[PDB]
Amino acid sequence: SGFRKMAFPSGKVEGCMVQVTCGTTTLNGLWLDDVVYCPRHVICTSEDMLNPNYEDLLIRKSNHNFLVQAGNVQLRVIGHSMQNCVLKLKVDTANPKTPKYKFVRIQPGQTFSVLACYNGSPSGVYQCAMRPNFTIKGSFLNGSCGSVGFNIDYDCVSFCYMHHMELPTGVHAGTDLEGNFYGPFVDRQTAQAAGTDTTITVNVLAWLYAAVINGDRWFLNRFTTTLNDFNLVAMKYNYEPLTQDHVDILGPLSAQTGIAVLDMCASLKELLQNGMNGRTILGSALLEDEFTPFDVVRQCSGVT
Amino acid sequence: SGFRKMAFPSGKVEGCMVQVTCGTTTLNGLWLDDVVYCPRHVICTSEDMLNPNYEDLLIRKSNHNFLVQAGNVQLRVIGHSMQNCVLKLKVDTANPKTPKYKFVRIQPGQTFSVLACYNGSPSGVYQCAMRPNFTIKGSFLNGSCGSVGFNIDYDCVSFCYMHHMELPTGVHAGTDLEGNFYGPFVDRQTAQAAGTDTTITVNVLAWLYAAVINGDRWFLNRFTTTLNDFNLVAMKYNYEPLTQDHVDILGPLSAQTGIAVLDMCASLKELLQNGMNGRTILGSALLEDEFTPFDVVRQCSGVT
Ligand SMILES: Cc1ccncc1NC(=O)Cc1cccc(C(F)(F)F)c1
Ligand SMILES: Cc1ccncc1NC(=O)Cc1cccc(C(F)(F)F)c1
């Protein structure tokens, strides 16, 4: 028993982290096979950032201008290309530590582990969620660009996020491993604000099931509700509308605990309307929305 | 900017995790050099657990009775010994992935990363704190015994915790890597309750500095206090008494933000007496005590 914001073990991702320098800019790169992936803003200067013409900037760059270093050894760049907002640096050596991997585009509400890196070296790992407004609430400083978000299915690492920028609101924006930004964000130092951030209802319900599984049952009540009634309350509190698809994913958790999904919804309804009254759930004084139903099943069953 | 409960990258520890079987019991082991460390309760049966005579039980065991497996390959046990509550299984092969390591006994209030494991395989990594009552609030299931807690200083892994048991209160108890339990706990399935759990005051103050560094400044006030006045309030709310040693460790955070330690104490005093009033600090509705002043400096400066 016990419930933690658990990240995936980061070893398979540490062996992929390299340092990429271009001009006076140094960020992180992802070395998979004979290719190094990194943010394309590596080719910019602090003046270029206001409105960079990445096509024109890349044209003034050669393979020898991109300095790639894995650990303390230099990699030989034999090709460079821009794919959306990432550069793909073809190196002459395949990464001997390349794991089984996939490049996947996650959905808002889905969670992932971030391996924060500086100068190609790992500093820490934390569990994150793609916000419904496509931002991430991470922990990143100057030099962290190139840090990746990932998930692990037994031996396969599914890369989903590459960190690119911090918005003036302190929140983080990035791309998938094909260089497409999540959300409306552009890699330009301009006025950018994310949409309204809603709470991932299905994740909060999944964490309510994790609480019951661990003994924290105080919030359970004698009531039920309907999807429509619950959703009227969810909208009032800027929660994601709950669908039958969400109910179905909560099926295993409902089966394990014997508490019907709509019954759990009624508990959530009362928690939203009445608050926690000074109590805590799983050591938290607010409703946690960064554990998907898959994360709860995984953590409560010990999937390695 | 941004602040997360960040764990150390776990790669150096994944390469040490093995599976140790003895009789019908399977738990995790730590392979460092030619030695495998694991909980000594691996030699017990479900009947022996009520009051095991570990000396007598170990005597009925030979080197060939301990099945050690790293990945999918078998290790040859050439020696076995009991050191306090751990078994040290000498194997004929040194771990080719052994990092630079130390065995350290941490203090209550200090934090560490846990790599939770099942059948010698890693499932996840989270950041933990040694509670003042010497328990840990982790996430462990049957098969997780042998999972280690650690800290990383550049290339050196300092092992501090080995997971042994869950108390009937759902909290976790374990030893250092010399087999000495933290706290009064014994590796016996008997009535065991931990002392009163107090809040690590210096860590809460360190996290208040992390909040100010990230823009969450609402809780800052026009007041100050003294160590004695603050401590009268800390005792009333079961907080650890703040000493001059704690003030000194908060020196770098005080210097960075320009907010005197006693000034921050006065904010904490008002937060304890008046509550959060429905607001949040670093996305939390309660006072976080699982980040030491070292963790805050490390995360806010990007130490790899
Ligand atoms: C300083 C920091 C902190 C956290 N995460 C990331 C960062 N770094 C940045 O944002 C770097 C940056 C600066 C201006 C413009 C861009 C660009 F995407 F090209 F538009 C990127
Ligand atoms: C089931 C579980 C969950 C979380 N963490 C740990 C566990 N497992 C245990 O506690 C195993 C255990 C059982 C009874 C007695 C002991 C002993 F330490 F020898 F005394 C240990």
XYZ file of C-alpha atoms and ligand atoms in Angstrom:
650
model
C 0.000 0.000 0.000
C 0.854 3.723 -0.304
C 0.512 6.023 -3.327
C 3.194 8.114 -4.960
C 3.646 10.324 -8.064
C 5.895 7.660 -9.559
C 8.070 8.181 -12.592
C 9.290 5.348 -14.888
C 12.936 4.243 -14.225
C 15.028 6.585 -16.400
C 18.016 4.410 -17.273
C 16.981 3.581 -20.824
C 16.608 7.355 -21.478
C 19.868 8.432 -19.732
C 21.837 6.359 -22.272
C 20.284 8.468 -25.098
C 21.037 11.935 -23.667
C 23.698 13.914 -25.480
C 24.783 17.584 -25.475
C 24.297 19.606 -28.695
C 26.092 22.911 -29.202
C 25.609 25.276 -32.125
C 27.328 28.607 -32.068
C 27.141 29.831 -28.489
C 23.928 27.827 -27.648
C 24.073 24.505 -25.773
C 21.041 22.283 -25.217
C 20.162 18.556 -24.948
C 19.781 16.009 -27.725
C 18.259 12.513 -27.987
C 20.557 9.942 -29.603
C 18.593 7.051 -31.039
C 20.236 4.860 -33.700
C 22.481 7.135 -35.919
C 20.232 10.201 -35.349
C 20.338 13.007 -32.736
C 17.042 14.867 -32.142
C 17.058 18.340 -30.530
C 15.042 21.641 -30.599
C 15.703 23.667 -33.786
C 16.035 26.874 -31.691
C 19.669 25.646 -31.034
C 20.688 27.556 -34.237
C 19.308 30.901 -32.938
C 21.032 33.834 -31.242
C 19.360 35.913 -28.448
C 18.445 38.507 -31.140
C 17.020 35.924 -33.630
C 14.497 34.664 -31.008
C 11.983 37.498 -31.452
C 10.954 36.187 -34.908
C 13.432 33.602 -36.278
C 13.494 32.575 -39.919
C 14.615 28.992 -39.235
C 14.944 28.164 -42.953
C 17.364 31.088 -43.474
C 19.240 30.390 -40.188
C 19.650 26.682 -40.928
C 21.051 27.530 -44.404
C 24.001 29.349 -42.771
C 24.827 26.092 -40.855
C 26.956 23.090 -41.878
C 27.331 19.561 -40.363
C 30.619 20.669 -38.683
C 28.767 23.565 -36.920
C 26.745 21.097 -34.795
C 28.834 19.820 -31.919
C 27.362 16.595 -30.532
C 28.916 15.040 -27.396
C 27.833 11.801 -25.637
C 29.385 11.696 -22.162
C 32.839 13.059 -22.961
C 33.268 11.767 -26.571
C 32.538 13.651 -29.747
C 30.083 12.369 -32.399
C 30.690 12.995 -36.086
C 27.743 14.730 -37.778
C 27.305 13.608 -41.423
C 23.793 15.069 -42.040
C 21.376 17.684 -40.732
C 17.709 18.384 -41.456
C 14.800 20.321 -40.025
C 11.581 18.379 -39.356
C 8.933 20.808 -38.102
C 10.563 22.295 -34.884
C 13.352 19.699 -34.382
C 16.714 19.161 -35.988
C 17.731 15.651 -36.951
C 21.500 15.339 -36.845
C 22.658 12.189 -38.594
C 25.828 10.888 -36.868
C 28.216 8.167 -38.181
C 27.749 5.992 -35.053
C 24.575 4.264 -33.898
C 23.939 4.664 -30.135
C 25.082 1.350 -28.603
C 22.581 2.008 -25.775
C 19.540 2.601 -28.089
C 16.526 0.933 -26.470
C 13.425 -0.394 -28.282
C 11.577 2.886 -28.962
C 8.580 4.547 -30.571
C 7.667 8.152 -31.313
C 4.140 8.695 -30.100
C 1.859 11.697 -29.861
C 0.015 11.551 -26.564
C -3.442 12.922 -25.819
C -4.183 15.732 -23.323
C -4.864 14.135 -19.937
C -2.286 11.371 -20.537
C 0.778 11.264 -18.271
C 4.529 10.803 -18.818
C 7.934 10.849 -17.127
C 10.355 13.683 -17.796
C 14.108 13.283 -17.554
C 15.334 16.846 -16.995
C 18.817 17.416 -18.456
C 21.535 20.101 -18.512
C 24.545 19.964 -20.887
C 23.451 16.435 -21.932
C 23.553 15.165 -18.321
C 20.508 14.041 -16.290
C 19.581 15.956 -13.122
C 16.217 14.413 -12.220
C 13.079 12.530 -13.123
C 9.456 13.402 -12.337
C 5.960 12.346 -13.378
C 4.051 14.912 -15.486
C 0.716 15.202 -17.335
C -0.139 16.764 -20.666
C -2.605 19.503 -19.544
C -5.903 19.802 -21.542
C -4.536 23.212 -22.770
C -1.453 21.203 -24.087
C 1.053 22.705 -21.643
C 3.076 20.817 -19.018
C 3.681 22.014 -15.455
C 7.284 20.839 -15.219
C 10.530 21.958 -13.603
C 12.879 23.351 -16.199
C 15.668 25.982 -16.222
C 17.897 27.535 -18.986
C 19.726 24.608 -20.654
C 16.859 22.117 -20.131
C 15.648 22.352 -23.792
C 15.957 18.912 -25.380
C 14.819 17.052 -22.206
C 12.335 14.334 -23.190
C 9.064 12.996 -21.807
C 8.436 9.245 -22.189
C 6.492 6.144 -21.130
C 7.843 2.549 -20.804
C 5.961 -0.621 -21.876
C 8.228 -3.477 -20.538
C 11.291 -2.871 -22.838
C 9.882 -0.264 -25.287
C 10.403 3.449 -24.567
C 7.679 5.556 -26.193
C 9.019 9.101 -26.583
C 6.238 11.643 -26.571
C 7.643 14.998 -25.519
C 10.661 17.158 -26.175
C 10.980 20.344 -24.062
C 11.310 23.603 -26.054
C 10.172 26.655 -24.089
C 8.882 28.276 -20.998
C 5.924 30.617 -21.406
C 5.903 33.956 -19.485
C 3.256 32.298 -17.234
C 5.946 29.834 -15.960
C 4.364 26.869 -17.774
C 6.153 24.674 -20.310
C 5.604 24.014 -24.036
C 7.151 21.454 -26.304
C 6.784 19.091 -29.213
C 6.389 15.396 -30.018
C 9.575 13.667 -31.451
C 8.494 14.721 -34.994
C 8.831 18.454 -34.041
C 5.091 19.246 -33.948
C 4.244 21.419 -30.937
C 1.501 20.283 -28.604
C -1.057 23.093 -28.556
C -0.900 26.377 -30.478
C 2.635 27.262 -29.403
C 5.311 28.504 -31.759
C 9.079 28.494 -31.094
C 9.325 32.286 -31.088
C 9.913 34.663 -28.088
C 6.512 36.311 -28.514
C 3.250 36.815 -26.519
C 1.865 33.345 -25.993
C -0.791 32.317 -23.531
C -2.289 28.833 -23.222
C -6.047 28.134 -23.221
C -8.078 27.683 -20.032
C -6.616 24.832 -17.965
C -9.315 22.337 -17.029
C -9.054 19.451 -14.539
C -8.763 15.932 -16.025
C -11.935 14.438 -14.461
C -11.202 10.750 -15.379
C -7.733 11.056 -13.719
C -9.257 12.567 -10.520
C -11.747 9.636 -10.442
C -8.879 7.137 -11.001
C -7.004 8.742 -8.025
C -10.240 8.511 -5.916
C -10.182 4.717 -6.649
C -6.423 4.676 -5.669
C -7.405 6.402 -2.395
C -10.105 3.804 -1.592
C -7.673 0.919 -2.407
C -5.267 2.434 0.199
C -7.741 2.917 3.061
C -8.572 6.622 2.652
C -12.371 6.111 2.353
C -13.813 9.093 4.333
C -15.088 10.818 1.146
C -17.317 7.882 0.160
C -20.976 8.744 0.429
C -24.570 7.335 0.292
C -25.231 9.047 -3.073
C -25.146 8.424 -6.786
C -25.566 10.665 -9.874
C -25.969 10.497 -13.692
C -23.394 11.460 -16.378
C -25.487 14.559 -17.275
C -25.956 15.694 -13.631
C -22.264 15.068 -12.802
C -21.208 16.978 -15.999
C -23.291 20.057 -15.031
C -21.167 20.169 -11.793
C -17.936 19.362 -13.681
C -18.483 22.381 -16.020
C -19.223 24.730 -13.092
C -15.804 23.774 -11.625
C -13.855 23.726 -14.951
C -13.520 19.939 -15.008
C -13.388 17.925 -18.246
C -16.817 16.576 -19.243
C -16.987 12.863 -18.331
C -17.942 10.576 -21.252
C -18.972 6.873 -21.486
C -15.392 6.237 -22.809
C -14.010 7.546 -19.475
C -16.494 5.344 -17.493
C -15.298 2.268 -19.531
C -11.563 3.008 -18.785
C -12.537 3.227 -15.082
C -14.066 -0.301 -15.432
C -11.077 -2.206 -13.975
C -10.895 0.164 -10.960
C -14.640 -0.069 -10.471
C -14.413 -3.913 -10.653
C -11.510 -4.065 -8.201
C -13.175 -1.844 -5.522
C -16.812 -2.763 -6.140
C -17.718 0.967 -6.322
C -19.699 1.908 -9.460
C -18.253 4.767 -11.567
C -21.347 6.997 -11.118
C -21.184 6.323 -7.345
C -17.556 7.624 -7.366
C -18.740 10.596 -9.483
C -21.259 11.459 -6.702
C -18.387 11.462 -4.160
C -16.434 13.771 -6.527
C -19.543 15.984 -6.911
C -19.735 16.395 -3.092
C -15.961 17.000 -2.873
C -16.273 19.776 -5.489
C -19.356 21.368 -3.860
C -18.274 21.017 -0.188
C -14.472 20.929 -0.366
C -12.149 18.680 1.673
C -13.164 20.358 5.032
C -9.540 20.310 6.226
C -9.042 16.595 5.539
C -6.627 14.974 3.071
C -6.844 12.218 0.436
C -3.604 10.243 -0.187
C -1.667 12.965 1.689
C -3.055 15.742 -0.525
C -5.414 18.615 0.298
C -6.604 18.998 -3.317
C -8.026 16.719 -6.010
C -5.070 15.156 -7.903
C -5.551 14.847 -11.713
C -2.090 13.623 -12.850
C -2.661 9.835 -12.564
C -4.527 8.193 -15.437
C -6.599 4.986 -14.693
C -3.642 3.033 -16.258
C -1.182 4.622 -13.771
C -3.391 3.620 -10.828
C -3.752 -0.033 -12.019
C 0.043 -0.151 -12.798
C 1.091 1.246 -9.384
C -1.469 -0.768 -7.379
C -0.441 -4.061 -9.167
C 3.371 -3.540 -9.464
C 3.835 -3.789 -13.249
C 7.588 -3.872 -14.027
C 10.899 27.860 -13.293
C 8.420 25.295 -11.895
C 8.816 22.956 -8.909
C 8.473 19.200 -8.849
C 9.007 16.287 -6.407
C 12.015 15.207 -8.449
C 13.764 11.892 -8.054
C 17.425 11.250 -9.040
C 17.848 9.456 -12.440
C 17.683 5.742 -11.561
C 19.925 4.194 -14.205
C 22.943 3.610 -11.988
C 20.642 1.741 -9.536
C 18.728 -0.294 -12.187
C 22.019 -1.968 -13.184
C 22.394 -3.237 -9.566
C 18.907 -4.758 -9.158
C 18.769 -8.533 -9.041
C 16.120 -11.089 -7.995
C 16.850 -13.286 -4.940
C 14.833 -16.433 -4.284
C 15.111 -18.651 -1.223
C 12.686 -21.480 -0.805
C 9.336 -20.185 -2.004
C 10.148 -16.471 -1.231
C 11.279 -14.058 -3.964
C 12.450 -10.510 -3.268
C 14.955 -7.942 -4.632
C 18.706 -7.794 -4.120
C 21.395 -5.130 -4.643
C 24.421 -6.349 -6.608
C 27.467 -4.229 -5.899
C 30.920 -5.667 -6.666
C 30.837 -9.481 -5.900
C 28.170 -9.047 -3.164
C 24.339 -9.200 -3.272
C 22.511 -7.411 -0.421
C 18.880 -8.310 0.399
C 16.486 -8.471 3.433
C 17.215 -11.487 5.685
C 13.453 -12.251 5.897
C 13.970 -13.979 2.449
C 14.801 -17.207 4.408
C 11.449 -17.182 6.291
C 8.189 -19.021 5.628
C 4.726 -17.443 6.287
C 4.669 -19.345 9.633
C 8.226 -18.281 10.689
C 7.290 -14.557 10.394
C 5.483 -14.314 13.743
C 8.786 -14.623 15.669
C 11.657 -15.847 13.443
C 14.904 -17.176 14.858
C 17.062 -15.928 11.969
C 20.223 -17.585 13.340
C 18.506 -21.009 13.389
C 16.796 -20.431 9.990
C 20.008 -19.301 8.295
C 21.807 -22.428 9.619
C 19.425 -24.652 7.604
C 20.495 -22.745 4.413
C 23.423 -23.344 2.036
C 24.956 -21.173 -0.763
C 23.065 -23.276 -3.382
C 19.711 -22.466 -1.645
C 20.005 -18.766 -2.607
C 19.003 -18.263 -6.214
C 20.364 -14.959 -7.526
C 19.374 -13.806 -11.042
C 20.498 -10.597 -12.829
C 18.221 -9.975 -15.816
C 17.851 -13.534 -17.091
C 21.277 -14.987 -16.073
C 22.072 -16.917 -12.941
C 24.773 -15.812 -10.455
C 26.862 -18.356 -8.581
C 26.701 -17.879 -4.798
C 30.010 -18.801 -3.085
C 29.299 -17.254 0.372
C 26.449 -16.120 2.606
C 26.362 -14.146 5.856
C 23.912 -12.266 8.029
C 24.797 -8.662 8.929
C 22.115 -7.297 11.259
C 18.859 -7.626 9.134
C 20.460 -8.156 5.681
C 22.023 -11.124 3.974
C 25.257 -10.641 2.079
C 25.489 -13.178 -0.718
C 29.003 -13.355 -2.111
C 28.830 -14.189 -5.852
C 31.758 -15.254 -8.115
C 31.183 -12.336 -10.542
C 31.579 -8.630 -9.829
C 28.692 -6.521 -11.223
C 30.073 -5.004 -14.453
C 27.602 -2.122 -13.937
C 28.696 -1.329 -10.313
C 28.735 2.458 -9.931
C 30.879 4.466 -7.475
C 28.923 3.895 -4.238
C 28.758 4.486 -0.502
C 26.628 3.048 2.287
C 25.328 5.942 4.320
C 22.934 6.269 7.224
C 20.739 9.291 6.644
C 19.159 11.507 9.286
C 15.388 11.910 9.825
C 14.210 14.830 7.689
C 16.685 13.997 4.891
C 15.270 12.929 1.516
C 16.059 10.158 -0.990
C 14.936 8.487 -4.216
C 13.385 5.033 -4.132
C 13.587 2.616 -7.034
C 10.639 0.280 -6.435
C 11.300 -3.241 -7.760
C 9.443 -6.539 -8.284
C 11.236 -9.822 -9.138
C 14.495 -7.835 -9.550
C 12.942 -5.532 -12.185
C 12.301 -1.783 -11.737
C 8.715 -0.485 -11.871
C 9.148 3.146 -10.800
C 11.071 5.894 -9.081
C 9.822 8.491 -6.591
C 11.233 11.032 -4.147
C 10.775 10.152 -0.447
C 11.764 11.532 2.980
C 12.898 9.772 6.123
C 10.085 10.791 8.551
C 11.171 12.068 12.036
C 9.564 8.828 13.426
C 11.992 6.913 11.036
C 9.275 5.562 8.735
C 8.887 6.285 5.011
C 5.584 7.010 3.262
C 6.350 5.073 0.088
C 4.495 2.964 -2.464
C 5.313 -0.685 -1.998
C 3.474 -3.992 -2.614
C 4.290 -7.713 -1.897
C 7.600 -8.446 -3.686
C 8.991 -4.904 -3.217
C 11.309 -5.927 -0.299
C 14.906 -5.268 -1.338
C 14.056 -1.993 -3.175
C 16.655 0.643 -2.268
C 16.611 4.343 -1.422
C 19.587 6.422 -2.619
C 21.073 9.848 -3.370
C 23.490 10.760 -6.231
C 26.492 13.133 -5.912
C 27.696 13.516 -9.584
C 28.898 9.874 -10.151
C 28.655 8.443 -6.592
C 25.472 6.625 -5.522
C 25.001 6.794 -1.748
C 22.720 3.919 -0.724
C 20.806 4.720 2.422
C 17.674 2.594 2.530
C 16.617 -0.961 1.868
C 12.858 -1.697 2.069
C 11.863 -4.483 4.507
C 8.271 -4.168 5.723
C 4.945 -2.501 5.736
C 3.462 -1.680 9.131
C -0.284 -2.336 9.744
C -0.679 1.489 9.538
C 0.294 1.344 5.801
C 3.661 3.038 6.415
C 7.034 1.557 5.479
C 10.060 0.452 7.539
C 13.510 -0.546 6.447
C 17.217 -0.561 7.109
C 20.447 1.115 6.008
C 22.754 -1.067 3.747
C 24.398 -2.522 6.911
C 21.037 -4.102 7.992
C 20.320 -1.719 10.896
C 16.655 -0.680 10.919
C 15.823 3.001 10.991
C 13.694 3.529 14.095
C 12.630 0.892 16.627
C 11.322 -1.580 14.054
C 12.092 -5.276 14.092
C 11.721 -7.685 11.143
C 8.966 -9.689 12.825
C 5.190 -9.797 11.968
C 4.214 -8.329 15.337
C 2.411 -5.226 16.749
C 4.544 -2.288 15.720
C 3.546 1.342 15.716
C 5.835 4.262 14.875
C 6.265 7.332 17.112
C 4.361 10.585 16.570
C 5.045 11.908 13.059
C 6.159 15.531 13.188
C 6.554 17.951 10.257
C 10.138 18.710 9.138
C 10.084 22.502 9.743
C 13.410 23.298 7.931
C 12.120 21.442 4.806
C 8.794 23.383 4.869
C 10.820 26.645 5.103
C 13.079 25.493 2.214
C 9.909 24.811 0.108
C 8.562 28.305 1.082
C 11.824 29.735 -0.418
C 11.259 27.502 -3.546
C 7.736 28.982 -3.790
C 9.018 32.591 -3.640
C 11.724 31.817 -6.280
C 8.885 30.611 -8.595
C 6.517 33.575 -8.200
C 4.088 32.193 -5.599
C 4.586 35.054 -3.080
C 1.029 35.632 -1.698
C 1.936 34.168 1.736
C 4.701 36.723 2.362
C 3.814 39.098 5.151
C 4.857 42.323 7.002
C 5.910 40.333 10.104
C 8.913 38.757 11.740
C 9.395 36.471 14.787
C 12.130 34.979 17.036
C 13.327 31.329 17.185
C 11.646 30.918 20.620
C 8.311 32.493 19.535
C 8.273 30.516 16.248
C 9.101 27.265 18.178
C 6.156 27.766 20.592
C 3.896 27.751 17.445
C 5.846 24.869 15.849
C 5.245 22.667 18.959
C 1.512 23.503 19.040
C 1.271 22.196 15.436
C 3.629 19.176 15.865
C 6.428 20.732 13.815
C 10.118 20.025 14.482
C 11.711 22.681 16.715
C 13.781 25.041 14.525
C 17.428 25.411 15.635
C 20.259 27.832 14.657
C 21.704 24.889 12.602
C 18.492 24.883 10.497
C 18.681 28.720 10.060
C 22.341 28.338 8.831
C 21.368 25.631 6.229
C 18.647 28.044 5.010
C 21.419 30.685 4.524
C 21.866 30.144 0.756
C 18.078 30.342 0.167
C 17.833 33.416 2.360
C 20.757 35.016 0.424
C 19.245 34.178 -2.963
C 15.757 35.627 -2.177
C 16.774 38.411 0.203
C 14.169 37.181 2.746
C 15.598 36.634 6.256
C 14.996 33.173 7.795
C 13.003 34.566 10.767
C 10.907 36.617 8.294
C 10.050 33.342 6.452
C 9.319 31.734 9.857
C 6.730 34.508 10.510
C 5.043 33.662 7.172
C 5.029 29.971 8.234
C 3.620 30.976 11.657
C 0.695 32.784 9.933
C 0.183 29.856 7.521
C -0.045 27.465 10.500
C -2.384 29.734 12.518
C -4.628 30.912 9.627
C -4.362 28.104 7.069
C -4.079 28.497 3.278
C -7.625 30.067 2.986
C -8.335 28.040 -0.168
C -5.153 29.135 -1.955
C -2.230 26.954 -3.077
C 1.577 27.153 -2.857
C 3.508 25.446 -5.711
C 0.282 23.643 -6.720
C -0.246 22.230 -3.217
C -2.948 22.961 -0.637
C -0.770 21.873 2.313
C 2.706 22.691 3.625
C 5.203 20.370 1.851
C 8.033 19.007 4.081
C 9.775 16.526 1.719
C 12.320 18.908 0.106
C 15.447 19.652 2.131
C 17.224 23.069 1.585
C 19.780 21.096 -0.557
C 16.968 19.758 -2.808
C 15.630 23.285 -3.366
C 19.096 24.727 -4.263
C 19.796 21.645 -6.506
C 16.458 21.878 -8.381
C 16.492 25.691 -8.687
C 20.134 25.658 -10.040
C 20.039 22.490 -12.242
C 22.828 20.423 -10.645
C 23.501 17.355 -12.843
C 14.606 29.456 -19.619
C 13.826 28.170 -19.704
C 13.176 27.662 -18.586
C 12.352 26.564 -18.720
N 12.154 25.921 -19.880
C 12.792 26.386 -20.960
C 13.628 27.497 -20.922
N 14.234 27.981 -22.094
C 13.588 28.582 -23.110
O 12.397 28.883 -23.082
C 14.457 28.864 -24.317
C 13.727 29.771 -25.274
C 13.733 31.150 -25.095
C 13.074 31.980 -25.986
C 12.412 31.435 -27.071
C 12.404 30.058 -27.273
C 11.810 29.476 -28.511
F 11.172 28.318 -28.293
F 12.726 29.275 -29.468
F 10.902 30.266 -29.030
C 13.050 29.234 -26.362
C 3.260 -6.557 1.641
C 4.236 -5.411 1.594
C 3.825 -4.147 1.190
C 4.697 -3.084 1.291
N 5.957 -3.197 1.738
C 6.374 -4.413 2.109
C 5.557 -5.538 2.057
N 6.022 -6.785 2.508
C 6.270 -7.102 3.793
O 6.007 -6.368 4.742
C 6.912 -8.459 3.984
C 6.894 -8.834 5.443
C 5.770 -9.416 6.017
C 5.764 -9.773 7.355
C 6.891 -9.560 8.127
C 8.030 -8.988 7.568
C 9.291 -8.881 8.358
F 9.969 -7.752 8.113
F 10.113 -9.917 8.146
F 9.054 -8.856 9.646
C 8.018 -8.615 6.231
